[model samples]
Target: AVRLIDLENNASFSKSLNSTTRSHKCTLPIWAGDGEGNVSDSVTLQDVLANDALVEFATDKNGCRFLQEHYPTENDNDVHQKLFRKLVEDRAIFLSLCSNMFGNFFVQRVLECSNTEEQEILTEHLATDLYNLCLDKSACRVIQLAIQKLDVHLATRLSLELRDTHLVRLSIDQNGNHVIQKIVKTLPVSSWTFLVDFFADDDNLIHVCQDKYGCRVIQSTVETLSTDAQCYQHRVILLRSLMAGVTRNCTQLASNEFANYVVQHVIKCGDALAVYRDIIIEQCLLQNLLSMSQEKYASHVVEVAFECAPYRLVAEMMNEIFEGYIPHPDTNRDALDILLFHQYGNYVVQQMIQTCVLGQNARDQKQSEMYGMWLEKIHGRVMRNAHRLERFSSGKKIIEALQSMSLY
Candidate 1:
């Protein structure tokens, strides 16, 4: 549409419209249609950013997009001479544009188009002002874009400008969180270990884990650190230090819409599992295994426990589900049976049975007996409900899964 708009403006424009006019300095409004007048094709982004888009050409924010689209793809020098220089000339206004829903695009385009030094020209200006810019709703997006584009030293330098509380709080902000995630993902796990210091406050860690915005940053860092053995070991040391707080309120966090993700991320990662095992499986499973097993969302925590916990932990979880021992006023049905036929819950039951099969052949006899009992109860419940099984596809899948277990 920028090209289309520019086409409308170009026919009406013609003048000393050569490179100098086409360069970034020209603020002629014809490109934006608010222009009383202007001259031609080679018009660069400088004109659009310099214009009073907040007033006259507000909607024509894309006025300069035409040059960006058709402009030569490799104009590193053009970028320096145009967008970079333009950003340099008016540092405050350029940073202000970072929040413009329309104006912000030009800021990102500068990063997209500029060469190394030219890019630095744009990024270095923000460093002094970044203390606040990284949290600005629109500016953070541009900041995140810059973080992803700049070299690690520069990105790390910029991110470290944010204090622990500020960054933690940013994790909960819809916009600022994205920048936090970008920093955690783009920088090396070693470089980001500073972010781990926040976990020192167990309560604060839990707060972050549950925050709708904060959780993503926590989860991404957890996942990235978990991918390698050494990195994972490093995280485990930190998680171990913070394990009690996380596990202290593990159930409350697991039931939360957002915090549960961070809980499960730690629960499922191999290194952290040893540190978090009793908390996640023994403590958490024993609390209200039934409701969690059948909960639309909390069930995920149960499923991860089954998938990642040791067979002993799995046996404890399976035994709890089978006994229907945990009281949940919501349903009187066998909680094991509830999971056997319910859509999402049944998958946990499926994992329960599969996990036991692998373990029954290797574990202690009492645990083996517990496993056998879980399988028998699951099979009995599904068979007893066979007549109604076909009413829902989940029931049929459970029936087929049970038969394949060879327990019939």
Candidate 2:
């Protein structure tokens, strides 16, 4: 046991050092030693917890069964889009490129080439690059196994333990890539393999993951996020989006099953953030998260909610706000207020004409879509509200956006 122990919840190859004399901004390592001086050459992670015994433990990879659940081979498109961390985009790009450059792999095999005076012709007969060597019957296995072996997360968490290993300590280093290239060539795997495989498939994404087993995998991912509130917020968001996507797009569960999930779990999540019939946002957490003044985060919540409006209820509420009938001067009231009052119909008409004639094509196209959608919703609203769009100052905001677009 030593003082410097940077333990990673996932990757446990780094952060296992005590000290370093030869320093050029180097990290320490995980120093696990027995009382009698026996030591583990490689430290490992078991679960999100790093347990470095003489025999290194396998990582749980974020959670106990995160990898097994979300990235399971039974499903297709298990890879979800991560904004802050794109687990799949880079992998997809690289793998697609590799496929294009080499060829679509129907088989994976290891080839040994021997050079001799007579067999010298074998040099060009096989792939010279060992890094690109294919494992027999392991297109997925090749990528998956390599990723499972990464200890970067472990290294970061247990930097003291792994810092001594030249590869573990180096991130964003000038010589890091070159060193890693050599290490990966000499050694067996790279940290990036698992990461890429985590988000990448053999391009058979949709076909592979549409079965019953894949649905079970999704259920497990949801269970993990629902249970772990503090640490897995980002994961929770991903699961939510995945569920939302399944509900909206995946025809298997799009209507009944996904709707049942919402009615059972999400819509009943809380009371307030209900925007009409469907609960676009959860009042307790979403409102709290939105309070933090992060433009991107708030925008994300709103955009996702708006997109998955399930019923037309969300669009309806938006219609009322834009029409100036629902005046919440404090919450969610923004510049769009100026562009939508029904009583400001004269001005709205004038502005539309002006925008049509004068505004740039892109600007006009966007504004036109907004106007059209709002107008469709407005018809239903005014019919229900008996045509009243009023505010305190008697000067309407809807009249204003219209006037802004006015030539006069």
Candidate 3:
């Protein structure tokens, strides 16, 4: 019988055998750290490595947990050094572990515990496969941590490996997008200027904003650049690019299923983005407010515009919705009544009511009086249609909102 102690010390013997075959070939002792049973509390990293089970321990669920828990607790530099040395000893094993489901966590733990030299070694190893790894579900997470933990020099080198085309692909990918967001969030603007440049073209800006995942990446980038004081120039360029893209496609994007959100987000960014909000109103929303308010996706943008746009712009939109009434040919109803009952348009009316009532207290007498007139118009409609309004859920919300304002 091959004793447990005999196998534990024989690195060459275990290395020659596959972990799958080793399991079926013989029952490994708990102390052998094969990850099958409870690993003995006494098993050291030295013992596990000597058995050539580092990869096995890292890939196995329990074995990975053991390494992640114990590796950092040890004070011995020699063992730590050996773990790092062995982890990078074979490129295939290292790369596999970096991408493995269970193994990636162990690799992350190793990254967290590694010294400057060790980190550089791992960075070099990972840099070559950064593109593929960024796309892998498990490895993407590891890359994010590496980006967060690596030295500035190393992280910059790794991030630079992703070319502009790669950045575009990653921004739209389900998993890869997250790594791009992380880079945008973690690294300085100088390191990620290429991403800003990607948005310089109106086509690229519009294309990314319309994608499901790419839209979120753009929003995150916008949020980062908008708030970060260090990159004022880059922020101006990015916002200008976004404004140009939004201007060129104002109507199309405001009505698109996904792109509308980017428009709404820009509006919601508040006074700093007044230019974008203004362009959206003047370009696409002024005369088209009635139709846009009734559209499924565009209505949401209209709602955000009412909630976030400047008072003058909002008043113009309110006038369009409330005063510029084109009575219904068949029902003889006005714009307010029509929107109050519409499936999507009702939301726009409610938002208008909210914006009017909440801000009335803060405005000048003229502004306050203007809101009062609008509120009175809405209240008149609600009272005239209380019974009819109660019949539908959307109408009920409008009625409830008017009542809360004490506008009886």
* TM-score winner: 3
Candidate models: Cα lDDT each: 0.66, 0.30, 0.80
Instruction: State which candidate has the highest lDDT.
Output: 3
Model 3 per-residue lDDT tens digits across residues 1-408: 875554323345665453543354333334454354656677777887677678877766767887888785343567776777778998888999989888899898887776677888889999888999999999999999999999989999888888655566778888998998999999987777788877767777777778898988888887776774353375777667656766878798889888888888888887557777788887898888888889999999999999988888988888887668778899888777778878888899889889889767854788877887889988888888888889988887787787756432
Better of 2 and 3 by lDDT: 3
Residue clash pairs of candidate 3: none
The RMSD of every model to the true structure, in order and in angstroms, is 8.7, 22.3, 5.5
Q: Which scores greater on TM-score, model 2 or model 3?
A: 3
- Which ten-residue region of model 3 has the weakest summed lDDT? 21-30
TM-score of 3: 0.86
Better of 1 and 3 by lDDT: 3
How many backbone clashes can be found in candidate 1? 3
Query: Which ranges in model 3 have alpha carbons more than 4 Å from their true place?
Result: 1-14, 18-36, 40-43, 73-76, 229-232, 323-326, 404-408
Clashes of each: 3, 33, 0
Between prediction 1 and prediction 3, the one with superior TM-score is 3
**Least accurate 10 contiguous residues by lDDT in model 2:** 106-115
